[PDB]
Amino acid sequence: SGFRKMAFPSGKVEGCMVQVTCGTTTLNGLWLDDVVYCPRHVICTSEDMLNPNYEDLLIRKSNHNFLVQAGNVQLRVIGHSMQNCVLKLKVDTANPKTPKYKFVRIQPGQTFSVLACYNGSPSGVYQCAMRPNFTIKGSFLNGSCGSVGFNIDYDCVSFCYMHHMELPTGVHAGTDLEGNFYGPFVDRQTAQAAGTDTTITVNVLAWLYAAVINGDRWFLNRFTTTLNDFNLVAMKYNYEPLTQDHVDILGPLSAQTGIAVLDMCASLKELLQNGMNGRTILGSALLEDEFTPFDVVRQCSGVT
Ligand SMILES: CN1CCCc2ccc(S(N)(=O)=O)cc21
């Protein structure tokens, strides 16, 4: 029993973090086999950041201008190349601690764990969601850049996020491990607008299922609705519209709880239109969209 915003164990990611220094900029890198991945903006001075030409800037840089350190091991750079917004530094030493991994580009509404780092050292771990507008509401100080997000499938680390920058709005933007931004962002220091953020309806339903499973059942009603009808109420409150794949993904939680998905939608419909009134659900006074149906099932069944 209980319900917490739980992060994946970080052990397997901790042994791949390194510090990368070029000129006087230092940030975090990911050391996998014989390659160190990091944000390419490591090569920019301050002036450079307003309007960087990354092709010209990189051409000026030699292997020995890159200082990759793992603890008090100093790795030697023998290669460098730029893949979109990430630098790949080929090093002489393959990471003895490289886990089973792959690079995945996640969709909006998906959750991942962040290992927040400074000078290649891990400082803490948190769970969060890729917002529908391709931002994250992170905790990142200066020199957190190159901090990575990941999931664990069994024994396999799925790397899905690298942190590049904070927007003047205070939210966080970054790339996949192939160097493509999530969202319409560019690694230059210019005023950049994120879209309208929406609430991730499918994740809020997963959370209400979580609440029922954990005793909190005051919000259930005998009312119902169709998708069509429900979705129309959802758009007015800036909730993502709910598809048939969404219903399909909640079927298991539906089966565990003997509450039809549509019946749960009808309870949500009502909460939007009438709110909580000082009631809480799993001790929160707002609706919570940073758990996937898969997160709820894992947490409520005991997956390692
Ligand atoms: C300094 N840096 C690194 C490269 C990308 C980027 C984007 C926006 C900003 S911002 N708006 O915080 O000045 C700063 C930044």
Curated annotation (Swiss-Prot):
Segments in the Cytoplasmic topological domain: 1-304
Regulation acting on activity, per entry: Inhibited by pyridone-containing alpha-ketoamides compounds 13a and 13b. In turn, alpha-ketoamide 13b (tert-butyl (1-((S)-1-(((S)-4-(benzylamino)-3,4-dioxo-1-((S)-2-oxopyrrolidin-3-yl)butan-2-yl)amino)-3-cyclopropyl-1-oxopropan-2-yl)-2-oxo-1,2-dihydropyridin-3-yl)carbamate) inhibits SARS-CoV-2 replication in human lung cells. Inhibited ex vivo by michael acceptor inhibitor N3. Inhibited ex vivo by compound 11a and 11b.
Reaction equations catalysed: TSAVLQ-|-SGFRK-NH2 and SGVTFQ-|-GKFKK the two peptides corresponding to the two self-cleavage sites of the SARS 3C-like proteinase are the two most reactive peptide substrates. The enzyme exhibits a strong preference for substrates containing Gln at P1 position and Leu at P2 position
Ranges for domain Peptidase C30: 1-304
Annotated localization: Host cytoplasm; Host Golgi apparatus; Host nucleus
Positions of crosslink type Glycyl lysine isopeptide (Lys-Gly) (interchain with G-Cter in ubiquitin): 5, 90
Effect recorded for residue 145 to A: Complete loss of 3C-like proteinase nsp5 cleavage
The protein's assembly and partners: 3CL-PRO exists as monomer and homodimer. Only the homodimer shows catalytic activity. Interacts with host FBXO22; this interaction promotes the proteasomal degradation of nsp5.
Function recorded in the entry: Cleaves the C-terminus of replicase polyprotein at 11 sites. Recognizes substrates containing the core sequence [ILMVF]-Q-|-[SGACN]. Cleaves and inactivates human TRMT1, preventing tRNA guanine(26)-dimethylation of tRNAs. May cleave human NLRP1 in lung epithelial cells, thereby activating the NLRP1 inflammasome pathway. May cleave human GSDMD, triggering alternative GSDME-mediated epithelial cell death upon activation of the NLRP1 inflammasome, which may enhance the release interleukins 1B, 6, 16 and 18. Also able to bind an ADP-ribose-1''-phosphate (ADRP).
This protein's name: 3C-like proteinase nsp5
Species the sequence originates in: Severe acute respiratory syndrome coronavirus 2
Lineage start: Viruses, Riboviria, Orthornavirae, Pisuviricota, Pisoniviricetes
